[PDB]
Design a protein around this ligand. Sequence first.
Ligand code: HEM
Ligand SMILES: C/C1=C/C[C@@H](/C(C)=C/c2csc(C)n2)OC(=O)C[C@H](O)C(C)(C)C(=O)[C@H](C)[C@@H](O)[C@@H](C)CCC1
Length: 403
Amino acid sequence: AFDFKPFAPGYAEDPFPAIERLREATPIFYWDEGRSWVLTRYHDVSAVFRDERFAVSREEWESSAEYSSAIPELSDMKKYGLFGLPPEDHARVRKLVNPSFTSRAIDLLRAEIQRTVDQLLDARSGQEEFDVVRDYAEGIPMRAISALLKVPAECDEKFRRFGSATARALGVGLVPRVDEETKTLVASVTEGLALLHGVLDERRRNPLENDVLTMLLQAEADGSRLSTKELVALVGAIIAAGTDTTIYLIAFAVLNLLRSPEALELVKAEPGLMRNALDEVLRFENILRIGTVRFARQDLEYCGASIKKGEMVFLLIPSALRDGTVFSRPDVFDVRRDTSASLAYGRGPHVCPGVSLARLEAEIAVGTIFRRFPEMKLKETPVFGYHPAFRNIESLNVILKPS
Ligand code: HEM
Ligand SMILES: C/C1=C/C[C@@H](/C(C)=C/c2csc(C)n2)OC(=O)C[C@H](O)C(C)(C)C(=O)[C@H](C)[C@@H](O)[C@@H](C)CCC1
């Protein structure tokens, strides 16, 4: 049950020695600063995802009151968003939007994503320094979500800001060390919600064929299928959930291929392996700092612990995914392995709706960059930060065509 310090300097860069220590010594421990139990092993993590004794709604938490008062601008999003809705409401909302996120539906986005990837590399690949985060990955995910929502590129920076702020603001009162000023967070959240109201009112005015937002609006207008608050919360969550995560995937992919020349040469030789490799990036080195949370609906015993009702539980994803009893050679980056058991996109009713979008964006972004600059080399050690949810890479400086 030893030493868990996920905000220590060095942890985001390389958390694996620390959490192997934890995982090898115990399946469960109490994280005093996080005020919650932490589960360290694959099977325990996997099960809790599907186990209905554990809720997602933060309203089940013993500290619900404190959490709901924090960032009142986000109260609606917390009550009516995908995490807060009761299971039958959650199923309903998911049944509605899931069709818009399949591989086939998101395939339409392919040309716009490639165009964005093309102009980012055109506009900045000429200087000495190329920052894979600042100059590349950062400009991609919002373009994608905005194409899916049919929002003009001029609004991209406002929504990205909103997405990233919202993801952090939702941590305030929930997770220990949100690394930003409230007033700044709150302003980006406010402005973003305003922008969103305008996007939605325009779409109701000018509804479109084969369009996610119009479909959601048309469901809201007809007999009870989606409330206005559910709808707004849903679009807001999609923007916030899909912004930073994908930035980190793309960056961690490039990093991990630069670090493993063998893996890269394999993906060069069989471009069809790119999809598996991107899944193995998340498996071998998951972008999450700690993981995700659940809340005990009732007192119960679990892996030798007496968990009380309302107590929070963290699933230590990056640990579970190095669990040697499920993955062979868990500590090797192997782009040929079977990655089916990866929990990186969740399991159960709350399984990530954006998985096909994240994979498409990253295949295009990571594929393109290595095809057009095959001899790319890391110019320096990646700089990591203190995002409360993510092992966030702030910069990843490389040399595209090295002398
Ligand atoms: C590689 C990037 C991504 C990762 C690793 C990821 C991971 C996850 C995970 C693990 C969950 C479940 C969390 C839990 O059960 O507590 C989830 C839920 C979610 N993800 Fe993703 N996601 C990613 C990208 C995206 C994108 C691009 C979108 C765009 C819409 C998205 C939208 C969502 C939403 C809305 C939920 C809530 C689902 C629900 O509660 O029903 N994600 N994601
Ligand atoms: C990868 C990941 C992204 C989901 C995204 C988010 C805010 C989703 C969502 C749906 S409805 C709603 C209000 N939000 O959530 C995030 O990007 C970060 C979370 O907002 C905060 C609350 C900061 C966290 O640390 C949590 C515990 C985070 O690590 C878990 C939830 C991450 C796995 C899911």
